[PDB]
Write a protein that binds this ligand. Structure first.
Ligand code: A1IDN
Ligand code: ZN
Length: 257
């Protein structure tokens, strides 16, 4: 029953998930002036050359591209991380309008969408164990602005009509997530949470400074998806973002000056 509506949206989630009011919730606004450059932060190591995509799923929240995570095929290392984190899936959040849709904001600026590449710390053995740990996940967040198309996004765009409604999936092999990355891997980082229920406080967030551009047509195709299942009243899948949460007793670090 949680969702993004008037009667079941972010404002309501604390009743079923009291951690919603916790000490390390995400997303947050990234105040670029008060983020501290940390010269000890390492470059991010994104190793996606052996990624094995399997499937794309509409789970009633977003669309989700899932990978084989039963071996170290696509991993994230370095940056603020001390472990080796395996890619399990990516998904997006987006708006009804080009001027909203991101979860994180930058100096209060909202982007049209935000890509989340989810990785789990291999020292915990499975994803289900990892989400129970304060250093279980590392989510790489990438902003999307509307402008020129992103060619490496088009294969995703093109399959969306085959997963229009909740519970639909489609085979999605040989997708290369390197086509979704910007030129720079400069980043901000802070400790936070899942941005959807169950809102677990298990995530090291790494948000890239440089957005990617996508076209107005690419994001318009995201907005054709449905929150509902087939045979139910149509509800367009838009505005599936949680707003910025209190930073509380946290410092956002920058890898760059
Ligand atoms: N936004 S976020 O990056 O913090 C985030 C996340 F970190 C995740 F790990 C997952 C998310 C999710 F958003 N989702 C959304 C799911 C999470 C809970 C299970 C199924 C219900 C829909 C929402 C995809 C599955 S998931 O891979 O478990
Ligand atoms: Zn997300």
């Amino acid at each position: 029953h949680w969702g993004y509506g008037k009667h079941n949206g972010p404002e309501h989630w604390h009743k079923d998930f009291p951690i919603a009011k916790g000490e390390r919730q995400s997303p947050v606004d990234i105040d670029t002036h008060t983020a501290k450059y940390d010269p000890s932060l390492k470059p991010l190591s994104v190793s996606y050359d052996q990624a094995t995509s399997l499937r794309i799923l509409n789970n009633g929240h977003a669309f989700n591209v899932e990978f084989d995570d039963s071996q170290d095929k696509a991993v994230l290392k370095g940056g603020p991380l001390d472990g080796t984190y395996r890619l399990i899936q990516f998904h997006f959040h987006w708006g009804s309008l080009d001027g909203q849709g991101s979860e994180h904001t930058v100096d209060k600026k909202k982007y049209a969408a935000e890509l989340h590449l989810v990785h789990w710390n291999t020292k915990y053995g499975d994803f289900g164990k990892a989400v129970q740990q304060p250093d279980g996940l590392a989510v790489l967040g990438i902003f999307l602005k509307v402008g020129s198309a992103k060619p490496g996004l088009q294969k995703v765009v093109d399959v969306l009509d085959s997963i229009k409604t909740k519970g639909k999936s489609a085979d999605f092999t040989n997708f290369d997530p390197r086509g979704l990355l910007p030129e720079s891997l400069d980043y901000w980082t802070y400790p936070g949470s899942l941005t959807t229920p169950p809102l677990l406080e298990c995530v090291t967030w790494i948000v890239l400074k440089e957005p990617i551009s996508v076209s107005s047509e690419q994001v318009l195709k995201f907005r054709k998806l449905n929150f509902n299942g087939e045979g139910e009243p149509e509800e367009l899948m838009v505005d599936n973002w949680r707003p910025a949460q209190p930073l509380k007793n946290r410092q956002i670090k920058a890898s760059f000056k």
